[PDB]
């Protein structure tokens, strides 16, 4: 991982939420770059999200 | 110079086994194994305990292969009990010792010849897509492995491009008193033409009789059962519906003489490859009594290597659960004169049937198109 810069519609909405709700945040990018679905892994009964 | 014992139960061609024992070429590995053919009745667990105790205390036995001819199920659990308590490796090649158990103990030292429940379910699912039987239902009782069986099909058919349709699953209990009326009432809800069963012989006969009381065992219904339902081909309860389909371990052309040689080869090669590399071999104080302090020398390395062997162009690697992981299976069918007929053979996920269309045993029409 390397540091990068982020901005856009969602970034400045988070800034508005933080100021009103009085919290401090750290942000990072998703590792695999996927939104998320439920799959099965290595022949197991469990089912886990990615 | 490892002592290997051979145990037979009941009547058997011992002379044939002795003649076929000296049919392997093991000159490329320092084994010089010992063979001890002992025979005894099926008296009880205590006789078995005494037999292995006396044999082990007799002359430095390092391994055992166990054969049988009965249909007992708890014998596998008993042999697993001895296997866990004393670190001697034993193998179950035939009879009731080949029946699968609930699970093996963590410290147990036991391996069996035969497929697991998951592999049997995978095999019997292939039979249903050879002939396009996409409508089925599952009925089973309380047995050590019932959940895994239904879980296997539920996992397999949920992610498929084929159109699978499952119509309810039954988990009826046969141990209830006066629950036979409820069992019969709930058996009427079945509508699919294909039924999968997971039981044992006695309750299989009970369920077959109850269903025949309802009558859905006659023309448009087909039943598939695993290997342990039939158990032995020679005896038929005569309440089994005609046309029953069952999977079974290949015994017609896989003679008992080959199994003993295969097990001896596995044990010898495992001991040799473990002896040569590690420069060590376990020869414990061969006494059956007073084994509380016998655990001084760990023998898990032998267990670690017993699951990967090969010889004479064959794969005999076991699994972590203690099953063959690569068996040879056959499919048997019940015809008019009560007997099992060999229909198809299964090997390496590949099915090979002797027919192209299932014989029917009217409102069934032919259709032509272009």
């Amino acid at each position: 991982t390397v540091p990068q810069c982020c901005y856009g519609f969602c970034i400045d909405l988070l800034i508005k939420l933080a100021r009103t709700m009085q919290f401090t945040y750290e942000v990072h990018l998703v590792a695999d770059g996927k939104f998320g679905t439920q799959e099965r892994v290595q022949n197991s009964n469990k089912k886990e999200w990615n | 110079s490892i002592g290997i014992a051979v145990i037979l139960v009941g009547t058997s061609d011992e002379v044939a086994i002795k003649d076929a024992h000296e049919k392997d070429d093991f000159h490329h590995l320092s084994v010089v194994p010992r063979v001890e053919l002992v025979a005894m009745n099926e008296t009880d667990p205590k006789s078995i305990i005494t037999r292995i105790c006396d044999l082990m205390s007799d002359r430095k036995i390092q391994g055992v292969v166990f054969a049988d001819d009965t249909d007992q199920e708890a014998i596998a659990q008993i042999l697993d009990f001895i296997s866990a308590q004393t670190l001697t490796p034993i193998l179950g090649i035939h009879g009731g010792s080949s029946m699968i158990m609930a699970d093996k103990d963590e410290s147990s030292m036991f391996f069996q010849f035969g497929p697991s429940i998951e592999q049997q379910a995978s095999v019997m699912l292939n039979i249903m897509e050879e002939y396009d039987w996409y409508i089925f239902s599952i009925v089973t009782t309380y047995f050590p492995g019932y959940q895994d069986f239904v879980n296997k099909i539920r996992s397999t058919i949920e992610n498929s491009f084929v159109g699978w349709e499952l119509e309810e699953v039954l988990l009826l209990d046969m141990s209830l008193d006066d629950g036979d009326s409820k069992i019969q009432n709930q058996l009427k809800k079945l509508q699919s033409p294909i039924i999968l069963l997971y039981c044992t012989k006695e309750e299989a006969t009970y369920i077959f009789e109850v269903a025949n009381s309802v009558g859905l065992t006659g023309y448009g219904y087909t039943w598939i059962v695993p290997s342990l339902v039939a158990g032995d081909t020679d005896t038929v309860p005569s309440e089994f519906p005609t046309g029953l389909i069952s999977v079974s371990y290949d015994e017609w052309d896989y003679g008992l003489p080959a199994r003993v040689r295969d097990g001896i080869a596995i044990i010898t090669t495992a001991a040799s490859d473990m002896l040569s590399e590690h420069s060590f071999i376990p020869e414990p104080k061969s006494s059956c009594y007073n084994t509380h302090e016998k655990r001084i020398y760990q023998s898990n390395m032998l267990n670690r290597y017993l699951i990967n062997v090969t010889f004479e162009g064959r794969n005999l690697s076991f699994s972590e659960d203690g099953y063959q992981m690569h068996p040879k299976l056959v499919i048997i069918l019940l015809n008019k004169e009560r007997k099992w007929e060999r229909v198809g053979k299964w090997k390496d996920k590949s099915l090979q049937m002797k027919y192209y269309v299932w014989p029917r045993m009217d409102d069934h029409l032919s259709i032509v198109t272009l």
Binding site: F23, T24, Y25 | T43, A74, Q77
Partner: protein, 370 residues
């Protein structure tokens, strides 16, 4: 008719007490007593069970823990040997959770509940002290898995998941990394389930990481209090104690009282056959024992010397009594009583870890998000 019963004990005084109990119960159908001692190995246990089962042809066997601390491996041979012929066995002082599996042990009942059942004491303490954020720290064993599974099933009723579950390998000497992760969480209430030797390793690391000060709450079990755990244990830890789990004499009397109730109701039924006295001879399953266990489990004992005795549909004791203990100034003082369904504290006061006298919030809301 005359029907005798058997038992497995290891004490001369216990044998005398059993003789007195059977003589007293004779005044309540004539029933005798047959008991033997314990052997230093399991195969001797199995052979002695089968030999003495043949001698007396008993219908049930009573088994208690030996003077051995673990009391885990010792009951196993008796269960298998009895189970093979399908004869009920009553367990008195066993706490391991392996014996609660019906598949492995077909015929086994409990006089006291298993170690894993002491998680409803924990569920009630969370409801009375409005605690909604907890950390579950368990070991990777069959004991830990059942305790985890019970807690998640109980918590799922309110739809309130546990914050996090952390698993450590049994018999480890380094848990610093696991404890570091738990220190960066919202909850401040820690539930621990391990063995006495293993628990002491966790306690030393917790005190080094300053996780035993103010604002922290520890809920442990019976094993985490006994043994050498008290040598390394911060003050304010709340433990549990079974009311009469260490009194084998009390269990013997009431166990006889409930089996004698069943033997009166067993001979008053049709198609009753004596279980075979042929240890060596018979390999068949006695028809009596599937029906016998059904009535025995439902045989609700009206009153006894250790409280009401009942059984769930697992062969386990119901409505047990627990004492909520507390460690202050290196000495444990009892604080409350749980009669199966509710918690009633006494006039004594509770000292929480760190020396404060006030229920803690058990929560620390974080103002930094990811």
């Amino acid at each position: 008719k005359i029907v005798n019963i058997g038992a497995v004990l290891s004490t001369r005084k216990h044998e005398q007490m059993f003789r007195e109990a059977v003589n007293q119960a004779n005044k309540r159908i004539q029933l005798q007593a047959t008991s033997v001692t314990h052997k230093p190995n399991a195969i001797q246990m199995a052979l002695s069970v089968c030999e003495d089962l043949i001698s007396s042809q008993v219908y049930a066997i009573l088994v208690s823990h030996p003077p051995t601390p673990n009391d885990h491996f010792t009951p196993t041979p008796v269960s298998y040997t009895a189970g093979f012929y399908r004869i009920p066995v009553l367990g008195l002082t066993t706490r391991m959770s392996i014996y609660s599996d019906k598949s492995i042990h077909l015929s086994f009942l409990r006089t006291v509940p298993p170690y894993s059942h002491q998680s409803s004491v924990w569920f009630e303490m969370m409801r009375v002290y409005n605690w909604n954020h907890i950390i579950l720290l368990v070991s990777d064993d069959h004991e830990g898995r059942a305790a985890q599974k019970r807690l998640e099933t109980l918590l799922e009723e309110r739809e309130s998941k546990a914050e996090k579950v952390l698993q450590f390998d049994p018999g480890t000497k380094n848990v610093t990394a696991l404890l570091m992760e738990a220190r960066e969480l919202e909850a401040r209430v820690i539930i621990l389930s391990a063995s006495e030797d293993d628990a002491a390793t966790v306690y030393r690391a917790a005190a080094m990481l300053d996780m035993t000060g103010s604002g922290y709450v520890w809920l442990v079990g019976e094993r985490e209090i006994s043994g050498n755990a008290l040598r390394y244990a911060p003050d304010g830890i709340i433990g549990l104690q079974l009311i009469n789990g260490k009194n084998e004499s009390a269990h013997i009397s009431d166990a006889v009282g409930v089996v004698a109730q069943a033997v009166h109701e067993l001979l008053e039924k049709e198609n009753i056959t004596d279980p075979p006295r042929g240890c060596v001879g018979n390999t068949n399953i006695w028809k009596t024992g599937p029906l016998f266990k059904r009535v025995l489990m439902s045989s609700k004992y009206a009153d006894g010397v250790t409280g009401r005795v009942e059984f769930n549909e697992d062969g386990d004791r119901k409505f047990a009594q627990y004492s909520i203990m507390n460690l202050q100034n290196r000495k444990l003082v009892q604080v409350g009583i749980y009669n199966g369904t509710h918690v009633i504290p006494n006039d004594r006061k509770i000292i929480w870890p760190g020396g404060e006298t006030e229920k803690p919030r058990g929560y620390q809301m974080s103002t930094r998000l990811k």
